[PDB]
Structure 1
Amino acid sequence: RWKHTSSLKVANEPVLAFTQGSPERDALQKALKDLKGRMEAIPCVVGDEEVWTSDVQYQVSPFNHGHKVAKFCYADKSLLNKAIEAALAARKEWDLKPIADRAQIFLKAADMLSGPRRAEILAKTMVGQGKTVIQAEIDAAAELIDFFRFNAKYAVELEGQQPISVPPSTNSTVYRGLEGFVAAISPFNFTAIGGNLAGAPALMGNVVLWKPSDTAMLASYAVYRILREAGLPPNIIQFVPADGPLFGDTVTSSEHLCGINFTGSVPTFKHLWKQVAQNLDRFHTFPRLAGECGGKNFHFVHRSADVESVVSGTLRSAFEYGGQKCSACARLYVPHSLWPQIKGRLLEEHSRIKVGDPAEDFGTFFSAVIDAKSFARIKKWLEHARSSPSLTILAGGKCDDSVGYFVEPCIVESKDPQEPIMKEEIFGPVLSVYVYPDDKYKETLQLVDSTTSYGLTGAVFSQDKDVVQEATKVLRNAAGNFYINDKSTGSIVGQQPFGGARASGTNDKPGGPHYILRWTSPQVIKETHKPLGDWSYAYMQ
C-alpha cells in the first residue's frame, strides 16, 4: 500500500529594528495612540458566548497605574464548570480533525501576528505589561509567532514518526490528544507564553481552559481573539480569567482534568501538583503537569572574559523588562582581578540607563515593574540591601510608586556568596555581585552550582576555551539553558529550547520539538490482514 504524507518547513520570525522612519515604528506609534485613554471591556469567553460576571477586575498600565487599560471579570465555579463541559463536548471532533487542519489555524494566526496585528499586539503588551518596544517585539511578535509556526512544524513531522510494519500486519501510531481538558495558566511577563501554554495543547487535539494573567489581560485577549479569527472553533480554548486559587480548586476538582500547563511561581506549581495528587482517585486518567517556574540565574566571569561583553550582556540580562524574566541574571560572579574594571564600567553604563514611560519615550531601556505586590516585594529587597552587613548597594536602590511601579536598576555587592539575595528570586531589576579570588575560581564554579535551589539559566564569560569546557561540565545541571559568552536571557524558538530542572520546573523545553509530546497520548493500531491460525504452537505438537 501507500499514503501521501506531509512535511512543513518553517523559519523564525525576523526581529524588526523599529528605527526612525521604519514602517513598524510608525505602525506601532499609531497603535499606541489608538490605546491612549481607552479601556477595553474584556469578557470571559465560553464557546462563542461572551460572559460577564459580577466579579469585575481591572488591568492598569505598570508605568502609569492610574490608567485602567482593561476591565475584565473572574469566572466563578459555575462558569468554569460550564466551560469544562462545553470544551469536553467539542473535544472528540477537534481531536479527530487532522493535524494539518489544526496546524493551519496556528499558521494563519502566526501570519496575522506577523503583519496586520503586529503593532496592536506589541502596543497592548507595552501598555499592559510595561514592555519597551523591543521587549514587546521579541515577545508578543517573534516568540509567539515562532511558537505557532514551529509547534505546527513539530506536530506535522510527529505524525510521520510511525512504527515498523511487518506482513501480514500494518502498524500505525495515532497521536490522540489527551482525554479530558487541559488547564492552561499563564504568567504576566510574556504574552508569548500564554499563547503557547493554551495553544500547543490545543494544536495537539486538546481542549483548554485558559486562565490568563490579570496583569497581561489586554494582550492575552488579543491573542485569544486572533486565534479565534484565524479559525479556532468554539470551545477549543475557553478564555476564562479567574481568581488563581479558585481556578486551581475548580480544575483540580474536575474528574475530567487531564493536564495543567503552568508557568509561574514554584509554590503555586507545587500546590497544584499536590491538589492533583490529593484528588488522584477521581480523575479518569492521570493528569499531566507541566511547570516552568523561576530561577536565580548567574553570569559567571572568568579572568579571561571580554569585559565589554560581560558588561553589556549583564546589563541586558539583569535589567531588561526590569529583570522580570525567569531567565534574568541576578548573580554575577567576578574574579578579583577584573572587578575594578567591571565595577567601573557597570557603574558608568548604569548611570546612562533611562527608566520611564516606554510608550512615550522610546529611549527607555526598561519601565516600571508589573504591579504593587511585586513593587512591594522589591522594596523589601532594596531595604534588605541597605540593612544587611554583607551587602552594599553600589548603584540605584531607589523606587517610586507615585506614578508607576518604578524601580531604579540596582546593583548590589555581596561579601557573602550565600547571602539570601544571592539565593532568592526577586523578579526585579536587582543584580547581586560576588567578587571571588582568581586563584579560587574552581571552588567558585562549585559555589555557582551549589548556592541556589534553581537550575534555569546561566552564562560563562571566558576567552579561555579550556575554562569553558570545564565550567560546562561543572555547571551541567545548574542551568538548563547555558550560555557561553552571551547573556542568560533571550531564548529563541528552535534555537534554544527553553527550560531547566532543579526547582525551576519539569523542563519540557517549550521551543523544542519534544515539548508537544506532553500533550499527546499515542494510540498504536495493528491491523492484521490474514486469518490467525491455530491457538496452539508447533513446538507443543
Structure 2
Amino acid sequence: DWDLLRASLMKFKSSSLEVPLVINGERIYDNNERALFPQTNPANHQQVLANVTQATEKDVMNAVKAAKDAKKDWYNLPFYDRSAIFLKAADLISTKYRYDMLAATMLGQGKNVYQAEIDCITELSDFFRYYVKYASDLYAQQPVESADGTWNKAEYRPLEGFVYAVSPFNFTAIAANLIGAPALMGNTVVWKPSQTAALSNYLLMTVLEEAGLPKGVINFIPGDPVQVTDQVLADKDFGALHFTGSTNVFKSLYGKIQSGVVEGKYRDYPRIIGETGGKNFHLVHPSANISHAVLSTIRGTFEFQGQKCSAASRLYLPESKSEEFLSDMFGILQSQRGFMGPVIHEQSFDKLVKVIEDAKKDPELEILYGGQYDKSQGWFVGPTVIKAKRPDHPYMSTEFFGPILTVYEYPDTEFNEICDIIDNTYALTGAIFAKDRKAIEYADEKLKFSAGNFYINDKCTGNILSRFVSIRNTKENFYEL
C-alpha cells in the first residue's frame, strides 16, 4: 500500500507530464503553438511535475461553445445518470486511482500523505456523494392538486447561461466542488484550474471522463488567469461565476462582471457564487485549558502552512496566561527540516518574506518565534509568531496565507472589550477557548457577525446547489369560463 503510493510518486517524479486542455472531450496539447506553464514541486522546485498547456483566446471561445452545445443533452440526461458519473468518479478516485491522485496532490500542491488523503480522496468523494443526496431531495417534487382545483408541478431548471468555474490551488476537493455542484444540476462548465494544481486537477478531469462525463459538459482550460478570464467574460451567454480564492481576485472578477452587466453584455443577470478567505481568529479567555488552546492554535495556524481559507491567523491572549501559552507553543514548535511543508509558489514565498522582513523594521511588531525561510530547494517558510503592540495593527487584519500568526495580548479584565474590538474591527471562522459559560455565551453573541463559523474549544479550521437552479412552476386550470 505504501509501496503503491511510492510507485505513484516515483512515476510522476521520474518524468514531466504534458497536461493538455480538455475541450469537448478532446485532449488539446501545446502542439508547437501554445505556451507551456511549468508546474514544479513546491518541496523541490527544480523538479517539473508537469508542462501545462496554456489556453489561447481561440481555445477559450471553443470551450464556451462546447459547453453551450452540450447543454440540452446534459440537462435532458436524467438526474440518475448525471449522478452516476459523479459517484463513479468519486469511487474511482477512492480506489482505482487512489495512489495516482494522492501522488499528484502531494507532489503538485505540497501536501504530505495525510493532508492529501483528507483532501483529494475523502473530502472530494464527500462533495460528490453529498451533492447527489441533496440534489436527489431537491428533485423529489411531486405534482399536487391545490385547494382551488388547479394542478401544479414545480421543476428546477439549470441556469440558462454557462458556468465559469475558477478553482484555487489549495484543495483538489474544492475544484471538484466548483465544477460538480453546478454540473450535477444540469449546468455546463468552463473551468480554469489553478496553475499550481494543474496535475491533480487534470487527473480529476480524466477521471470524470472515464466515469462517462459527456463531451463539453465540463471544459478544462488552464491558462493565463487574466487572459482566459477576460475572454470567458466577453460571451453573452455567461451565466455564473463559481469562485474560490483570494478576496482581491474575487473583487477583480466581480468588477469585471459588473462592468459587463451595466454595459449590458449579458443575456441574463449572472450569478456570482464566491468563497473567499478571511483573517480567522482564535480568542483565548483566561479560563481556558491552556494546553488544548495551544495545540489547537498550532494545528489551526500552521497545518498545511496556513494555506486554508479557514486557517487561524490572529490570536488574542489574556496577559495573565500569555507567557505560559507562548512558552508552551514555542516548545512544541521547536520540538517538531524545521519546516512542516512548503508554500505553493515563489510569489507566495516572496510575499511571506516581505511580511517577515517588514516585521523586523516595524517598531509596533516583535517577532517572538521563527521567521525562518529558505528558497534554495523549495518554497520553505517556517512557523512564525508575531506580537503586535496594538490590536488594530494591519498584521491583525491583512491576509497572509502562510504559516504566520499575529498575536495581541489583552489585559484579562478587558475580555468583553476585546470581543467588541474584534466585532467592530471580516472573517470566515473564529474560535473561543474558555471554560466559563458566561464568557462563552457573551463572545458567542457579540461575535455573531464576526464569523460564519464559530468554534468553542476547537480550532477554527474545524444548500449551495440551489444557487445553480431556478424554480419554474406550472399550473394547470381545468375550469372553462
TM-score (norm 1): 0.86
Whole-Å separation in 1 of the counterparts to 2:145 and 2:369: 66
Once residues 455 and 395 of structure 1 are traced to their aligned partners in structure 2, the CA distance between those partners, rounded to angstroms, is 25
Query: In structure 2, what is the equivalent of residue 293 of structure 1?
Result: 276
Deviations 1:229-248 (A, max 9, x none): 11111100001002111122
- What is the match of residue 331 of structure 1? 314
Q: Does residue 448 of the first structure (1) align with residue 422 of the second (2)?
A: yes
Contact preservation (8 Å) 1:103, 1:156 = no
For 2:453 and 2:145, how far apart are their aligned partners in 1? 38
Q: 2:21 aligns with which of 44, 48, 51?
A: 44
Moved more, 232-241 or 276-285: 276-285
Query: 1:302, 1:370 → 2: CA distance?
Result: 34
Give the Å deviation of 1:175.
1.3
- Structure 2 contact 432–455 (Cα < 8 Å) conserved: yes
1:370 — aligned with what? 344
Secondary structure at the aligned position of 1:455 is classed as: coil
Change (3 A) 1:355 1:116: farther
Contact 1:355 1:368 (8 Å CA) reproduced = no
Unpaired segments ≥5 residues, structure 2: none
Q: Distance in 1 between matches of 2:43 and 2:104?
A: 13
Verify: 1:82 aligned to 2:31, yes or no. Answer: no
Amino acid at match of 2:369: A
Cα distance 1:276–1:165, how it changes in 2: closer, same or farther (>3 A)? farther
* Cα drift, residue 168 of structure 1: 3.5
- Aligned-residue sequence identity (percent) comes to 43
1:308 aligns with 2:291: yes
CA contact (8 A) 1:59 1:217 kept: yes
Question: Which digits, 9 at most, give the CA deviation of each residue in 1:458-504, with x for residues without a partner?
Answer: 111111122111111111111111111111114xxxxxxxxxxxxxx
Q: Distance in 2 between matches of 1:161 and 1:268?
A: 38
Aligned AA (1:207): T
Where does the alignment leave 5 or more consecutive residues of structure 1 unmatched? Answer: 1-22, 357-365, 491-513, 535-541
2:12 matches 1:65: no
* Secondary structure of 1:75 counterpart: coil
Alignment length, in residue pairs? 475
Contact 2:143 2:151 (8 Å CA) reproduced? no
* Matching residue's letter, 2:13: K
**Residue matched to 1:138:** 118
Q: For 1:138-537, list aligned pairs within 5 A.
A: 138-161=118-141, 164-166=144-146, 168-280=149-261, 281-353=264-336, 355=338, 366-451=340-425, 454-490=426-462, 514-528=463-477, 530=478, 532-534=479-481
Distance 2:437 2:337 in 1: 36
TM-superposed deviation, 1:29: 2.8
Structure 1 runs, 4 residues or longer, greater than 6 Å off: none
Deviations 1:266-301 (A, max 9, x none): 222122222222212121111111111111010000
* Aligned-partner Cα distance in 1 for 2:434–2:29: 56
SS at match of 1:279: helix
> Any conservation in 1 of the 2:18–2:29 contact (CA below 8 Å)?
no
Residue 340 of structure 1, CA deviation: 1.3
CA distance in 1 between partners of 2:62 and 2:408 (Å): 53
Shift of 1:163: 6.8
Q: Distance in 2 between matches of 1:233 and 1:173?
A: 27
Post-superposition Cα deviations, 1:334-357, rounded to whole Å, max 9, x if no partner, equal 11111111011011011023545x
Contact map agreement 2:37 2:53 (CA 8 A) in 1: yes
Amino acid at match of 1:138: I
Distance (whole Å) between structure 1 residues aligned to residue 252 and residue 12 of structure 2 = 37
| Residue identity in the other structure for 1:47 | N
What's the CA shift for 1:533?
Answer: 2.3
AA aligned to 1:183 is Y
TM-score (ref. length: structure 2): 0.96
* Cα displacement (A) at 1:164: 4.9
